[PDB]
Amino acid sequence: MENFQKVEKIGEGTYGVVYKARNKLTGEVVALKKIGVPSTAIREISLLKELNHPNIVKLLDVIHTENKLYLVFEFLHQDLKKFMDASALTGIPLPLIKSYLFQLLQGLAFCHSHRVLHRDLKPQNLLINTEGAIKLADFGLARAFGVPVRTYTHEVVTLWYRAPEILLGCKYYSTAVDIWSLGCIFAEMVTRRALFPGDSEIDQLFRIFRTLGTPDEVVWPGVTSMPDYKPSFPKWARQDFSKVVPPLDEDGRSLLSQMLHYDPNKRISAKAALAHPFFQDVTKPVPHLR
Ligand SMILES: O=[N+]([O-])c1cccc(/N=C2/N=CCC(c3cccc(Cn4cncn4)c3)=N2)c1
């Protein structure tokens, strides 16, 4: 595209590559995502340009030229995964963790009220600035194309944040999947280890089952009728969160437990999450950004 100077490759997506670039007119610097895109795709993506929220990475333009689609986004200078690697040694303080989870819930509360889900939340698509904001990136991209097993660079698309209804074959899942992803990310920022690092689908499910208990009709009506449910699934006993996310306080474990309910129908909504006591004292710290 003529209108942009690519200034650097910043990343590789499932769908495409990201370059930092400069609007050759506005001189705005933007993140330029390179993915005749089969055209529900176009309609459903061009739509996101009005799904605007402070904790949503602004989608400034879509440009469809030849067999290429560029998505043009406000540039944020880094992602949650690098910031969390940048704080292995100490971890993100708790007050910043809370503020991020709060901001992310606001993002989701908004998308979800407009019936839009992300479906692929993960630290790599949460972008942070130096003013203590965090935003969700890559919406409607999973609806508009479905998520593949490799990326365009043949890289493995991670299952670590994927809700159990999706892993169980559910075709028609809901805004709850994103709450499950955000729960996994919340536990990961507190402990500095991913919570469920599956390396395949059945490994992902079994790491889930090992921590939260193999699900049954007690905890999740309808689950034994799911498409990839098997009676032969080993029966693991649930485990106490106090062990899973120390040192989260009671209010944060209580909220985590609700974002991780097996039954998407019981899993706390974003709206409800925003009201939980864990946020009574939430403040917006400044990240240490390097
Ligand atoms: O993960 N990054 O490429 C990355 C690193 C550092 C800064 C970055 N800045 C932005 N700013 C706005 C949007 C944006 C972005 C947009 C869509 C998807 C993603 C996630 N992704 C990462 N690689 C491919 N996609 C990031 N990145 C991105």
The experimental technique behind this entry is X-ray
**138 and 12 in contact (C-beta within 8 Å)?**
no
CA of 16 to the centre of ligand 1 (A): 11
Task: Give the integer Cα–Cα distance in Å for 154 and 157.
Answer: 9
Task: Give the integer Cα–Cα distance in Å for 79 and 135.
Answer: 9
* Neighbour count for residue 91 (Cβ, 10 Å): 14
With a CB cutoff of 8 Å and minimum separation 6, the contacts of 248 are 190, 241, 256
- Count, residues in the chain: 290
Q: Where are the domains of the chain?
A: 1-77, 78-289
Amino acid at 147: V
| 3-state SS class at 33 | strand
**Ligand 1 pocket member 124 (CB < 6 A):** yes
Q: Which superfamily, per CATH, for 78-289? A: Transferase(Phosphotransferase) domain 1 (1.10.510.10)
Resolution of the solved structure (Å): 2.2
Amino acid at 233: F
Backbone angles phi, psi at 154, to 5 degrees: 75, 5
CA of 125 to the centre of ligand 1 (A): 6
DSSP bridge partners of 31 = 20, 73
**Ligand 1 pocket member 123 (CB < 6 A):** no
Backbone angles phi, psi at 150, to 5 degrees: -90, 165
Query: 158-187: buried (b, 16+ CB within 10 Å) or exposed (e) per residue?
Result: bbbbbbbbbbbebeebbbbbbbbbbbbbbb
* Neighbour count for residue 260 (Cβ, 10 Å): 24
**Residue 177 in tokens:** 């999947």
For domain 1-77, give the CATH number.
3.30.200.20
* Neighbour count for residue 13 (Cβ, 10 Å): 21
Backbone angles phi, psi at 56, to 5 degrees: -110, 125
Amino acid at 25: L
